[PDB]
């Protein structure tokens, strides 16, 4: 049923209902931990709510599953930047370019 | 100082307990119903029935007799008194009590069966 | 098979073969104790054989099962009368009238 | 001539029996506690509760009413009286009794639910 | 899966899709009857659709589960008010204040 939870997550995310999106993505992920896109979007929802530590944790996880996601690399850099982790933000930004 | 329906409440509880075989409780309840108003032949009768259920037939006799004192047409009380006397070996009273029950109701086949035995045991 | 035993009982009874009727009714009754009519007729067969104590026992049983049988009440009175149980015979006779 | 704690002993026994669902015993015990001292609103109330458990709501009404006569702030008695009246089809009294319970305690959601139904049934 | 149904309910509710929200809350509640918040929101969705009797039934249920929800008490009062049940609306309004 993870596929439905996933879709709810995307819908809530797009609509700005990040709290709903977070719970829905977590449901989908609990059932299927390898959904890199859901991890990415989960990280984005946390980012939107100001939790940049969680956003980092999830962007890294999404990247471990998919190292090619330049947007996750970029958003990782953004969350790091928000936390003052500038050397790291720079590296992640470069990683997105690479 | 009030308790206008006291006897009724105790009586009804007594009936419930009798029906459920809880004769000790029923005795208490009937006794209380009568204790504050000892004029209900039905309660005297049911007190006797609860005592009869208990097995202390002599107590049952006193209670049934009182029911008859209040109402001598209670053929059933006459019958159980006859049964109580019969149980005690008093076949002469068992006969008199069963006959009274039968004068009130000649078709009481059980009173007849027990009367027949009382005459044979006498 | 009680139903067949019962019929044998009635036939033997009508024919005056009370000893046969008694055994046959007892067979039917052993299988089915609630047959008030058979108890009544059993009592009648005993009555016919002079056993008025047994006739009483069975009339009473038949009456317990069926208090409306005026004939059982009457025959009860007759058996009681035969035994010298006159107060009882009178009561049973009245019971038949009642 | 003594029995200084009689009502207390009977009351406590009544409570135990009520808790165990033994409402007939509880009625007897509460009745006795009150019989020698009919001034405890709690016992009148619990007598009403035992009667309510029994199902003879009219008896429950008299007992709860007495509890209110001793103490009119017993919102729960007001509530169960309203329930007893409701059960009897007396929706007009059910309303009055539930409203009184709510004036005492506006957050009694059950009294509100039952009051709403009483107004609809009225 | 009640948790997902619940989230759909909240999303639909927020978006004004009260008919969807009602079905979704009922699904979540069928699976988990003790969700007081869902009962409350179900009542709100009915309220929004004009069914003030259902709104009352659900607010009361939500309150039985959680007597502290002043908003349910208030909304109960509103639904009662809509139905002309003024003494009751007043009591519920006071209950919210209490």
Author numbering:
A (entry chain N), C (entry chain Q), E (entry chain B): 2 to 99
B (entry chain F), D (entry chain A): 1 to 122
Please quote the authors directly:
The sole target for neutralizing antibodies on the virus surface is the envelope (Env) protein, a homotrimer consisting of three copies of gp120 and gp41 subunits that are associated by non-covalent interactions. Methods enabling the production of stable recombinant trimer immunogens based on the ectodomain of Env have catalyzed recent HIV vaccine efforts. Hence, the efficient trafficking of Env trimer immunogens to follicles following immunization is likely essential to promote optimal humoral responses to HIV.
We employed a tetrahedral nanoparticle, T33_dn2, which consists of two trimeric building blocks (four copies of each), and can present four SOSIP trimers. An initial cryo-EM reconstruction of the entire nanoparticle verified the appropriate assembly to the target tetrahedral architecture with four BG505 SOSIP trimers flexibly linked to the nanoparticle core. The particle diameter is ~37 nm and the average apex–apex distance between the BG505 SOSIP trimers is 31 nm. However, focused refinement in combination with partial signal subtraction allowed us to treat the nanoparticle core (consisting of T33_dn2A and T33_dn2B) and the displayed BG505 SOSIP trimers as separate subparticles and analyze them independently. Using the approach described in the “Methods” section and Supplementary Fig. 3a, we reconstructed a 4.6 Å resolution map of the nanoparticle core and a 4.5 Å resolution map of the BG505 SOSIP trimer. The refined model of the T33_dn2 nanoparticle core revealed a high degree of correlation with the design model predicted by Rosetta at the backbone level. When compared to Rosetta models, Cα root-mean-square deviation values for the trimeric T33_dn2A and T33_dn2B components were 1.20 and 0.81 Å, respectively. The C-terminal helix in T33_dn2B was not resolved in the EM map, suggesting a high degree of flexibility, which may be at least partially influenced by the 6xHis-tag immediately following this sequence.
